[PDB]
Design a protein around this ligand. Structure first.
Ligand SMILES: OC[C@H]1O[C@@H](O[C@H]2[C@H](O)[C@H](O)[C@H](O)O[C@@H]2CO)[C@@H](O)[C@@H](O)[C@@H]1O
Ligand SMILES: OC[C@H]1O[C@@H](O)[C@@H](O)[C@@H](O)[C@@H]1O
Length: 563
């Protein structure tokens, strides 16, 4: 209890960032106070709240959070944070309507005493921000922003940094964003993670790592990138003898290390653990919920490979139901909620929960992974909510960086997933040792430039069929979408797409390979698109339903417009 206080409850000061701001922008209040509490992260010890009301009567009850300011520096090869000033409490709000808001601050400590701040008025003007990310009501396969524009996640996992900490995100994120990336995922556990909130304790949260997460979220705000926050990872509940980067012996949850749990099975039902987990959710909502750059709350990385002594499907399901309900109830902005599994088909008992707004796949597979992605995407349409392939790679023991230094595997997967009907790109691993040093960002730029002007929410896209190849010299396969107005094709050579030794193609090729006949009504306009250079190659008007296939080395994209 290093942050305890033993004084009569009183507000000592309030600082307000600005009295005028734009729609969906951050409005921050600093609160200096004294009171009686053992743990500023526990609302039963001290509960700070901001009560906001727009001019239409809508009310928002925003929990406040304990905060320490830091100044970062780089000490040779590691980030070091110097504390600045005493810690204090903050409220972070974001207005969804324009016009006037009134708000006040309310504080209650463990004595039951309650104090209040006077009503303040702020004014909100229109801004460029599109709002929070939601499931599309027009097409449940896809995400939208509040303003109705689509959100197609294009990016990769970027889940933790080296010892350089936030300085790595300074490098990775601008490169991602300038190459069409608008998405990444970060880990808030286990305790070794860059943004670990439960670093030494499950009762009190790490103010340095929370500040690093502030920094990276602010950088995403500047770059128009949107983040999935993964709260916990399976390692926390996996025993040393079970392998796969286990961490139970080191995790703060374990009684040996000060926590409430005698064994990982008890995580799901232990009353003390559930209480502190809800305090963590409240802290996360308080500190980060305002941000439209939070794409989603993700409870678990691969919860199915916690210790087999700890995975009880009925209890994990109930815990996800209860925590999703709680999180929704306290999150004024109702961010999307999800969870993930190592087993690529997932766990239907959990994926079917209505409180999980979208489902995910993790898949590491070396052989015929294009077909495996297609099959999984087709299968999970049964949930009638969006599907994110949140992790993807070879099953090569982490050797992708030297088996495939050109990123052909990533290339194949991001084209396959977005043109099979998934909500966005397959999300690669290996951001730090592969994507960045091998400079693989250009793959994403080529894909983003192909899809960005299509409104997927209105095309009524269906996976391509009723097609007939007529190709004699090669084995060419197709992944395709057929919509109201567009047909999008990704063609690949089955005998070249899975070999990674040759250099990046630079076709000069103008040559005729074969044809693909589609059941569509002509006339049409056909655009041939280089998937490595990210450029239109050729354009052709047609009066029949048979599209010539021009020469290409590994794969080729075609955009067809029904006229
Ligand atoms: O290297 C940093 C952390 O790696 C962690 O293991 C990772 C591992 O690097 C790899 O990405 C693997 O497939 O997923 C693991 C996490 O589940 C931990 O070993 C951690 O201790 C390291 O700091
Ligand atoms: O920032 C990502 C990486 O960039 C490299 O050039 C080095 O500086 C690494 O130390 C760093 O982790």
């Amino acid at each position: 209890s290093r942050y305890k206080d033993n004084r009569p409850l009183n507000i000592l000061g309030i600082d307000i960032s600005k009295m005028e701001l734009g729609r969906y922008n951050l409005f921050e209040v600093s609160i200096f106070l004294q009171g009686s509490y053992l743990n500023p992260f526990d609302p039963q010890e001290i509960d700070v709240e901001g009560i906001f009301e727009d001019q239409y009567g809508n009310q928002y009850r925003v929990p406040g959070f304990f905060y320490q300011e830091y100044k970062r520096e780089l000490k040779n090869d590691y980030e070091y944070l110097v504390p600045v000033g005493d810690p204090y409490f903050k409220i972070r709000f974001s207005p969804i309507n324009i016009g006037s808001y009134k708000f006040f601050i309310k504080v209650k400590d463990k004595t039951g005493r309650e104090v209040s701040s006077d009503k303040y008025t702020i004014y909100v003007k229109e801004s460029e921000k599109p709002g929070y990310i939601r499931v599309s009501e027009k097409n449940w396969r896809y995400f939208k922003f509040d303003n109705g524009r689509q959100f197609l996640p294009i990016g990769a996992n970027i889940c933790w940094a080296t010892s350089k900490g936030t300085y790595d995100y300074d490098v990775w994120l601008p490169k991602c964003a300038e190459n069409g990336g608008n998405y990444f995922r970060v880990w808030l556990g286990p305790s070794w993670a860059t943004f670990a909130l439960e670093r030494e304790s499950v009762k009190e949260y790490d103010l340095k790592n929370a500040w690093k997460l502030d920094y990276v979220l602010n950088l995403a705000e500047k770059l128009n990138m949107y983040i999935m926050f993964c709260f916990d990872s399976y390692n926390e509940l996996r025993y040393q003898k079970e392998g796969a980067y286990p961490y139970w012996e080191h995790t703060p949850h374990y009684e040996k290390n000060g926590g409430p749990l005698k064994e990982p099975k008890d995580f799901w039902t232990n009353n003390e653990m559930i209480k502190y987990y809800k305090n963590k959710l409240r802290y996360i909502v308080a500190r980060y919920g305002y941000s439209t750059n939070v794409f989603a709350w993700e409870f678990w990385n691969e919860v199915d490979i916690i210790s087999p002594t700890a995975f009880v499907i009925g209890e994990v399901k109930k815990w996800h139901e209860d925590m999703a309900k709680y999180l929704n109830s306290i999150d004024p902005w109702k961010h999307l909620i999800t969870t993930s599994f190592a087993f690529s088909p997932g766990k239907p008992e959990i994926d079917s929960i209505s409180g999980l707004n979208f489902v995910q796949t993790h898949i590491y597979k070396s052989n015929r992974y294009i077909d495996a992605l297609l099959s999984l995407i087709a299968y999970k349409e049964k949930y009638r909510k969006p599907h994110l392939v949140g992790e993807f790679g070879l099953d090569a023991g982490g050797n992708d960086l030297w088996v495939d230094p050109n990123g052909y595997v990533i290339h194949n997967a991001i084209w396959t997933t977005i043109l099979s009907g998934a909500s966005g790109t397959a999300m690669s691993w290996w951001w730090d040792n592969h994507i960045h040093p091998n400079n693989l960002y250009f793959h994403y730029r080529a894909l983003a430039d192909f899809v960005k002007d299509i409104n997927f929410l209105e095309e009524k896209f269906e996976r391509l069929t009723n097609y007939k190849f007529n190709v004699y010299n090669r084995e060419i396969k197709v992944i395709g979408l057929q919509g109201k107005k567009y047909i999008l094709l990704w063609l690949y050579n089955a005998k070249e797409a899975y070999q990674y030794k040759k250099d990046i193609p630079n076709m000069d090729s103008s040559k005729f390979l074969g044809s693909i006949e589609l059941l569509i009504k002509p006339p049409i306009k056909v655009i041939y698109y280089d998937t490595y250079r990210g450029e239109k190659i050729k354009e052709l008007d047609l009066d029949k339903n048979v599209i010539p296939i021009i020469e290409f080395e590994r794969d080729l994209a075609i955009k067809i417009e029904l006229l």
